[PDB]
Every structure is written in C-alpha cells, then in structure tokens.
Write a protein that binds this ligand. Structure first.
Ligand code: NA
Lengths: 99, 278
C-alpha cells in the first residue's frame, strides 16, 4: 500500500497584487506518512513554513497543510515542491490565482 | 444540527533508532481542539482551541496520561503485528486508530465507532452494534479472539455511549460561539477564456464551516457532468474551508449554465450565474 500525494496550491484569500495573504500547499491521499513539502518563491525554498498536525481520511490516507505568509506580485513565481517514496522526482505545482 | 467528536492516532516505527513517532489529534466536528506530538518539547496534551483552555489542570493531567498510554499501546502493537506478518525488523511500519461518537440535532447518541489499520489497510474494527469485531484477515482474527476474551468491546461501548457523548455536549456548550455557529459559503463566479470561442466558468465557495458542501452545475436546468471539474474541499488555514467547480462552455452561451450550492448554513440552496461583466 503506497499511495501518491494529491497536491493543491492556493491562497487563503482571493489574491490581489501587493496585498499580504497566505500561501497554502495541501497534500492529501498519500501513504506512508513521511513526506517532504517545500514552498518556493522564484524557485527558491521559503524558510519559515509551518504545517498542520498529521491526520487521515476514511481510507486511512494522510493529509497535511503547509502554509506561510506571502504577498502576491506581478513579478514573483510561487510553487509547492513535494517528494514522497511513490514519486521518482519531486513534483512541482505552480501557484495560479485562478485555482 | 448533528455533531461528532473524534480522535485520530498515528504511530510510525523507526527501525534505525528509538521509539515510534506518535501523533494524536482530537476534533469536535471539523475543529481541531487538542494535539499530542511525541517530537514536541512539552510531552503534554496541548490545547488548540480557545474554549478548551477553560479546562483545569486535572483535565490536562488526565488527558496527558491517557494519550501517553495510547502511544505505548501502539508501540507494543507495532511489535506484535510485525511478528504476526513475519516482517523484518529493518522496515518502518504504521498503525492508525480512530474512534468517536455522533449525536443528532437533539444532542442524543446516534452512533459510535472504533477502527484500527496496519500499514494503511483495515485491520480490526468494532461493528456498528458496538458488540463485535470485523477482522480483515487471519492476523486480525487472532487479535479478535484476544479482545473477545478480555471484554474489550464492552469497555469501548461504555465510553462511546457515555463519556464520549457527555463531554461532547460539554464542549458544544463551552465553545458555543464557534462550534454552534455555521458559516455559509461566500460564493462568486469567475470567467477564463480558453480560446476565442470557449471559456471556463468557475464557481467558488469560500470561508465556509462545517466542511460538508455540494456544488453542482446545470445546463438549461438539467445536471451537467461532461466537461466539469471539481476539486477536493480544502482548508483555508483559518478554520474554514474552500471548494470550487468548473465547466467549459461555448463563448456566448454562459447564461445557460447555473451553479448550485448546498450547505448547512444556507436556508435555501444558492444559484449562481455568470454576470456578463467582470
Ligand atoms: Na525515534
């Protein structure tokens, strides 16, 4: 039983350039529980990132929220980078404010 | 409405060195209110909601003793199941446990549950009668015979129908200002061209509580599933939840499509339509 993570990267509030907000990376559906999650700004790892306490769903798969404050701009790229035993290479999902 | 109290426990063995990693969380409905983490400095059950901080030191002492006892049970089980399954001492394995109770709108007991998993699969679970056990395989059958001999289901039933529901009602009263408040979805629709003659319509539900919600698309008032996409409900990070649904439509035909939102905080279901200005 190895299940690969599903990833959603999004903001806590509807995003406006220049107004502070919170960047979220929600990882769910995975097993076993060890997982590496980074939030990236312009390809580089953000360093004060916090996360929720591990919990799990009906089918026993795990989920976690990773989050940090950020200020969206026209210029900066944000993304979530996930590695797990089920993945060959780390998976990078770019933040899109429409999703 | 109806309410629930649930505790979740995860233990992960560390064959290389030391004791398993153990994490425990308690919820009322979709609100986390206590946690324990074996890697944290305090080694105590800790509050995670304002209304539980009311409880006195005898509460926090008792809960810390019980959660550490749970952690030792998991440690022992990890060793026992490794033997049942003839597994190496070199690998890491996981045990998970969840239990809790539901009450109806009258706050009376509706159902209880107590379930256990090994390496992410069903192992043993109390049946809905709270008297007997579902064992998934012959290893769990061995555990079932031990728990029948030791009256385990009787003690769990007493807790689930008694203590569990009594303290749930206590928490619902003390935390009334949030736990009994419903937050209806704040809804809006966005429009994203995908070509000069098709567009995505995306229906958003934001900042709602509890997490249960239904979002559905209709075209000329019939259900629509073709060319739709629905993301899993996700936490906002401030205690509320988010969801969206989307459909691809021919440009110029947006008024045919309606998004319908059902949630406990809405007296009547909501209907949204694209407003031809953005
Ligand atoms: Na350890």
């Amino acid at each position: 039983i190895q299940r690969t993570p599903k990833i959603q990267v999004y903001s806590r509030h509807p995003a406006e350039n220049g107004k502070s907000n919170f960047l979220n990376c929600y990882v769910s559906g995975f097993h076993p529980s060890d997982i590496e999650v980074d939030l990236l700004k312009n390809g580089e790892r953000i360093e004060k990132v916090e996360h929720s306490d591990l919990s799990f769903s009906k089918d026993w798969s795990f989920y976690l929220l990773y989050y940090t404050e950020f200020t969206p701009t026209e210029k900066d790229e944000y993304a979530c980078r996930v590695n797990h035993v089920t993945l060959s290479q780390p998976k990078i999902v770019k933040w899109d404010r429409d999703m | 409405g109806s309410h629930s109290m649930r505790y979740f426990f995860t233990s992960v063995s560390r064959p290389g060195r030391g004791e398993p990693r153990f994490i425990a969380v308690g919820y009322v409905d979709d609100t986390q209110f206590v946690r324990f983490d074996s890697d944290a400095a305090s080694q105590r059950m800790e509050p995670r909601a304002p209304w539980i901080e009311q409880e006195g030191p005898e509460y926090w002492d008792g809960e810390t003793r019980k959660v550490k006892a749970h952690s030792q049970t998991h440690r022992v089980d990890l060793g026992t199941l490794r033997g049942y399954y003839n597994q190496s001492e070199a690998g890491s394995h996981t045990v998970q446990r969840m239990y809790g109770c539901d009450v109806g709108s009258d706050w009376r007991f509706l159902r209880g549950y107590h379930q256990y998993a090994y390496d992410g699969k069903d192992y043993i679970a109390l049946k809905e009668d709270l008297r007997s056990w579902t064992a998934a395989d012959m290893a769990a059958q061995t555990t079932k015979h031990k728990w029948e001999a030791a009256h385990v289901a009787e003690q769990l039933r007493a807790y689930l129908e008694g203590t569990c529901v009594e303290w749930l009602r206590r928490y619902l009263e003390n935390g009334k200002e949030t736990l009994q408040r419903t937050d209806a979805p704040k809804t809006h629709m966005t429009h994203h061209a995908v070509s000069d003659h098709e567009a995505t319509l995306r229906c958003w539900a934001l900042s709602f509580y509890p997490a249960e919600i239904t979002l559905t698309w209709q075209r000329d008032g019939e259900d629509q599933t073709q060319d739709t996409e629905l993301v899993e409900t996700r936490p906002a990070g401030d205690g509320t939840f988010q969801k969206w649904v989307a459909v691809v439509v021919p440009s110029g035909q947006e008024q045919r499509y309606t998004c319908h939102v059902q949630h406990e905080g809405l007296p009547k279901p909501l209907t949204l339509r694209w407003e031809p200005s953005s």
